[PDB]
From a paper:
Cryo-EM analysis of [name](3E) revealed the presence of 8 parallel fibrils assembled into filaments with C8 symmetry with a periodicity of 112 Å, which was also validated by the averaged power spectrum of the aligned filaments. Our model building revealed that the coiled-coil within each protomer unit (CC1-a1 and CC1-a2) assembles in an antiparallel manner, spanning residues 9-105, unlike the previous publications following a conventional assumption that the coiled-coil running in parallel with little structural information. Interestingly, the C-terminal helix of each protomer unit forms an overhang and reaches into the adjacent double-stranded helical arrangement creating a triple-stranded junction. The key residues in the triple-helical junction are the N-terminal residues Y15, [name], L19 of one strand and the C-terminal residues L89, Y97, Y105 of the partnering coiled-coil helix. While residues [name] and [name] were oriented towards the inner lumen, residue [name] was located at the interfilamentous interfaces. These negative charges likely act as a repulsive force to separate the [name] bundles into 8-stranded filaments, making it amenable to our structural analysis.
[name] is a fibrillar protein involved in dynamic microtubule remodeling, including nucleation, co-polymerization, and microtubule branching. In vitro studies have characterized [name] as a microtubule-binding protein that facilitates the nucleation of microtubules. Although its precise role has been enigmatic, [name] is essential for cell integrity, and it is highly conserved across eukaryotic species from algae to humans.
Numbering used by the authors:
A (entry chain C): 7 to 43
B (entry chain D): 44 to 105
Write the structure that this text describes.
């Protein structure tokens, strides 16, 4: 039973990992916007 | 320019901090997804002696 519950939360955490990357890439674009101005 | 520099520092501070915060969880999940293979063997192992306990009773029936 613990095999599936732990693995399911890993995917949710891995989903958050992609979400963090999206914010990171957007922050670089926001940084580029600040650089241009 | 100070407002933009403060904005640049605010963005850059979060930018690098989020990268470290994300990579520490990402590399931890790389071991966690490998632990899923261990959990696959764990599920295999736990059910194995459960059937052995059944087999501990089953061969007694013979």
């Amino acid at each position: 039973g613990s095999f599936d519950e732990i693995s399911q939360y890993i995917q949710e955490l891995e989903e958050e990992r992609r979400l963090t990357e999206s914010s990171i890439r957007k922050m670089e674009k926001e940084k580029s916007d600040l650089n241009e101005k | 320019i100070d407002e933009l520099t403060t904005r640049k520092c605010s963005v850059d501070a979060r930018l690098q901090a989020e990268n470290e915060r994300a990579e520490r969880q990402d590399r931890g999940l790389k071991e966690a997804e490998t632990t899923y293979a261990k959990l696959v063997e764990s599920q295999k192992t736990l059910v194995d002696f459960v059937r052995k306990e059944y087999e501990d009773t089953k061969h007694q029936k013979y």
